[PDB]
Amino acid sequence: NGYENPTYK
Amino acid sequence: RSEATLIKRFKGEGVRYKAKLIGIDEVSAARGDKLCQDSMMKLKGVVAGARSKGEHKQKIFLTISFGGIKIFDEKTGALQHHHAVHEISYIAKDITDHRAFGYVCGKEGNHRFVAIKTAQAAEPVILDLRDLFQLIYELKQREELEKKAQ
Numbered sequence: 819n820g821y822e823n824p825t826y827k
Numbered sequence: 828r829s830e831a832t833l834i835k836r837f838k839g840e841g842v843r844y845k846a847k848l849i850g851i852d853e854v855s856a857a858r859g860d861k862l863c864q865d866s867m868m869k870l871k872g873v874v875a876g877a878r879s880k881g882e883h884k885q886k887i888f889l890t891i892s893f894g895g896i897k898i899f900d901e902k903t904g905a906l907q908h909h910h911a912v913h914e915i916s917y918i919a920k921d922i923t924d925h926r927a928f929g930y931v932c933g934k935e936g937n938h939r940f941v942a943i944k945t946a947q948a949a950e951p952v953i954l955d956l957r958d959l960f961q962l963i964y965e966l967k968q969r970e971e972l973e974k975k976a977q
């Protein structure tokens with residue numbers, strides 16, 4: 819699966 | 828995975844990876860598997876059609892570090908793309924291809940999906956990215972609880 823970046827923004 | 832060893836691993840130039848640039852595409856969301864699964868196929872297809880004209884993907888090498896993701900042209904060594912960690916929102920591998928992955932760059936309303944074909948498996952790159960993101964989050968919390976506990 820994919821992984822989103824917790825520090826995005 | 829010791830925070831200390833992991834910090835040494837991404838320090839400075841960080842890890843290097845030989846790969847080819849499949850392409851860059853403008854997308855609408857900052858995340859989502861299907862959306863980021865579709866865009867990969869669209870780019871590979873553009874590439875596939877180009878093979879008939881003797882086209883070839885640009886050979887590159889990329890680095891994973893505290894500077895985020897950087898793409899350097901293999902031939903001239905020139906830095907062509909520098910995507911800071913805070914600008915990266917989603918990481919996604921390619922299910923039907925173990926040697927390709929992508930990620931979305933950009934601020935709200937101006938996203939881009941970058942597709943890469945790695946020389947070796949894309950697994951180690953996705954992993955490094957994962958750890959680097961988590962690391963930065965942790966160091967950011969701790970180094971905030973401290974400044975706020977001043």
Ligand SMILES: O=P(O)(O)O[C@@H]1[C@H](O)[C@H](O)[C@@H](OP(=O)(O)O)[C@H](OP(=O)(O)O)[C@H]1O
Pocket residue numbers: 847882883884944945946
């Ligand atoms: O053997 P053929 O029929 O020439 O086809 C090549 C083969 O599929 C290589 O694996 C591929 O490199 P990657 O695996 O890194 O894509 C290369 O792409 P390129 O021409 O874009 O380098 C193709 O041209």
